[PDB]
C-alpha cells in the first residue's frame, strides 16, 4: 500500500506500477473512504530526505522505461532521450537541471567567503578539467592582488578574476555572456526574448552533448562487455550465466517477507510468462488482453 | 497529446502517396466521402468535420510491452546489433573444408597441418559463441545497474558536465 | 492465465523501487527518532 506521501508523488508520475496504486487509491476514495491528513511536521532535514527517497521511487521505474538511443544516427534520438529524462525529473519533483544544480552550488557554498573555497566545495559538481582551469586563473589573480580573492563580487579584485574566468568559459565553448543575461534578464520582453533564444540554443546543445556522452559510454561499455564475452567458449558462457542467475535467485529467496524480494520473484514469473506467451504465437507476440 | 486538438478535415491529406494503399476523399463543406482501397479490400465511409474532432478526445496512449524493461531491450538490441557486426566478419571466413582432403593432408608439413586443423577448430569456437544469442539478455543486465545508478543522482536524472559547467559560470560570474 | 493486461504489462521489472522503498521505510522512521533524541 501507499503511506499517503508516496501517493502524492505518484499523481503526476506516469510509470505503470505507480499509476496502478494511484488508480487503486482513487477507487477507494470513491467508495466512501476518508483521505488522511498530510503531516504538518518533519523539519527541513527530514523533509528533504523524504524528497530524496520519494523522487528516487519515481525516477527508478522511469529510467527503466526510457529506451537508450544506442547506435543511432543524428541528434533527435539523443534529444528524445534527454527530453524523456527531463519529463521524468519533472514528474519526480525536480526542477530544470539548470535550476537544480545552481541550487546545489548555493547550498554547498552558503558560508564560503573566499573563491578558493567555492572551487573546493563544488568540486564534485563541476568538471575536473574546468575546476582546474579556474584554479589556474585563480592563482594568476592570487599572485597579482597578493591576497585571498573574496567571494563578494562588488570588490574590484573579484572582477579581476571574474573577467578572466569569463575568458575561460568562452574558451571551453560556452557563451557566458548569454548565460548571465538569461538569469538576470532585461527590461523589455522583446530583447529578453532574443537572449532567451540564444540561451536555449546553448542549453539544448548542452544536454544533448551530455546525453550523447552518456550514450557513447554505454555503447563503449556494451562493446567491451561483448568482446570479452565473444572470446569465451560457449560452455564457459552457459555455466557462468547459470551461476550468476542462481547466485541472484538465492539472494532473493533467502530474504522473504521483504517487499523487494517478493516483487523480484514475481518478476521472474512474469519473464517466464512472456516467454510462454511468445511460444504460443510468435508472429503476434505476447498476448495482451483488450 | 494535450486535452484539445485542432486538426482534421481541414488541410487534411487528400490522397495517398503509396501504391500499396489508395486513398481518395471528397472534400465537401459539411462532410467528406473518403474511399480507402488497399489490395483486395475496399472500404468507403463518410466522416464529418465534427466527427474527426471527437477522435482525439479519448487518447490511445501506446506503450511498449517489453520482456524485462524498455531500457533493457534497448541494450539488448545494441548487443544484438554489435553481435551482427562480428557475425558479418565470420561470414567472410575462407572455406577451410575445401582443404580437408588427403591430397592436402599428405603434401603438407605435419605441423602446418596441425595449425590448419586448429585454425578450423577456432572458427567453430568463434562461430558457436557469436550465435549464442540467448546470452545477450544476461549481458544487457550487466550494463543496466551501473547506468541506472547514474540516473539516480541527487541533482537530476538528466544532469551532465556541460550543463553543470555553464550553470557554474552563472553562479561564479554573478555577485557572490 | 494467458492474456494478462496492459496496465501491468507496462511495468519495468527489475528496477529497484522497492529496495529504495525498503531503505526509506527503515531510514525515515529511524531518523525521525534520531533528531527528536539528539543532544551534543
Amino acid at each position: 500500500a501507499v503511506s499517503k506521501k508516496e501517493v502524492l508523488y505518484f499523481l503526476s508520475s506516469k510509470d505503470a506500477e505507480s499509476s496502478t496504486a494511484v488508480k487503486s487509491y482513487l477507487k477507494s476514495l470513491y467508495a466512501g473512504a476518508q483521505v488522511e491528513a498530510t503531516e504538518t511536521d518533519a523539519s527541513e532535514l527530514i523533509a528533504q530526505l523524504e524528497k530524496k527517497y520519494l523522487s528516487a521511487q519515481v525516477v527508478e521505474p522511469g529510467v527503466h522505461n526510457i529506451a537508450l538511443p544506442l547506435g543511432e544516427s543524428g541528434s533527435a534520438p539523443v534529444k528524445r532521450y534527454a527530453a524523456e529524462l527531463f519529463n521524468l525529473g519533472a514528474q519526480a519533483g525536480f526542477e530544470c537541471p539548470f535550476i537544480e544544480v545552481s541550487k546545489k552550488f548555493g547550498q554547498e557554498t552558503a558560508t564560503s567567503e573566499t573563491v578558493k573555497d567555492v572551487l573546493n566545495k563544488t568540486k564534485s559538481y563541476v568538471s575536473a578539467d574546468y575546476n582546474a582551469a579556474l584554479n589556474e586563473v585563480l592563482s594568476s589573480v592570487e599572485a597579482e592582488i597578493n591576497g585571498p580573492v573574496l567571494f563578494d563580487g562588488k570588490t574590484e579584485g573579484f572582477k579581476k578574476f571574474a573577467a578572466k574566468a569569463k575568458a575561460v568559459a568562452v574558451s571551453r565553448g560556452l557563451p557566458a555572456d548569454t548565460i548571465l543575461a538569461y538569469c538576470a534578464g532585461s527590461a523589455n520582453e522583446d530583447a529578453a526574448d532574443k537572449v532567451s533564444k540564444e540561451f536555449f540554443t546553448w542549453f539544448e546543445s548542452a544536454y544533448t552533448a551530455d546525453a550523447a556522452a552518456e550514450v557513447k559510454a554505454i555503447e563503449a561499455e556494451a562493446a567491451s562487455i561483448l568482446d570479452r564475452h565473444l572470446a569465451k567458449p560457449v560452455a564457459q558462457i552457459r555455466k557462468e550465466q547459470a551461476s550468476a542467475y542462481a547466485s541472484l535467485l538465492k539472494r532473493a529467496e533467502t530474504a522473504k517477507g521483504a517487499k523487494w524480494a517478493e516483487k523480484y520473484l514475481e518478476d521472474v514469473k512474469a519473464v517466464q510468462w512472456f516467454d510462454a506467451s511468445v511460444a504460443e504465437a510468435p508472429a503476434s507476440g505476447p498476448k495482451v488482453a483488450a | 497529446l494535450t486535452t484539445f486538438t485542432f486538426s482534421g478535415l481541414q488541410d487534411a491529406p487528400v490522397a495517398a502517396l503509396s501504391g500499396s494503399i489508395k486513398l481518395n476523399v471528397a472534400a465537401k463543406a459539411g462532410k467528406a466521402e473518403v474511399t480507402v482501397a488497399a489490395g483486395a479490400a475496399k472500404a468507403a465511409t463518410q466522416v464529418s468535420a465534427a466527427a474527426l474532432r471527437k477522435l482525439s478526445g479519448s487518447k490511445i496512449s501506446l506503450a511498449e510491452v517489453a520482456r524485462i524493461s524498455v531500457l533493457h531491450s534497448s541494450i539488448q538490441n545494441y548487443l544484438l546489433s554489435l553481435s551482427n557486426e562480428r557475425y558479418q566478419l565470420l561470414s567472410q571466413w575462407p572455406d577451410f573444408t575445401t582443404m580437408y582432403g588427403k591430397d592436402f593432408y599428405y603434401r603438407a608439413h605435419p605441423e602446418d597441418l596441425k595449425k590448419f586443423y586448429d585454425a578450423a577448430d577456432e572458427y567453430y569456437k568463434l562461430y558457436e559463441t557469436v550465435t549464442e544469442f540467448d546470452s545477450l539478455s544476461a549481458l544487457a543486465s550487466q550494463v543496466v545497474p551501473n547506468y541506472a545508478a547514474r540516473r539516480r543522482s541527487t541533482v537530476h536524472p538528466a544532469i551532465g558536465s556541460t550543463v553543470a559547467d555553464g550553470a557554474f559560470t552563472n553562479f561564479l560570474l554573478s555577485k557572490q | 492465465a494467458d492474456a494478462k493486461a496492459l496496465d501491468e504489462l507496462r511495468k519495468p521489472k527489475f528496477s529497484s523501487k522497492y529496495l529504495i522503498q525498503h531503505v526509506s521505510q527503515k531510514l525515515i522512521p529511524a531518523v525521525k527518532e534520531w533528531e527528536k533524541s539528539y543532544q551534543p
Partner: peptide
C-alpha cells in the same frame, strides 16, 4: 537475465567514463 538491485545515489557529476576499444575486430581479422 536478472541484475542485482542497488539502492545508492550518485552525489557527483562526472563524465560517464568511456571504456577503451577492444581488439576483437583486429584479433578476428588476424
Amino acid at each position: 537475465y536478472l541484475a542485482p538491485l542497488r539502492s545508492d545515489f550518485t552525489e557527483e557529476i562526472t563524465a560517464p567514463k568511456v571504456a577503451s576499444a577492444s581488439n576483437l575486430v583486429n584479433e578476428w581479422n588476424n
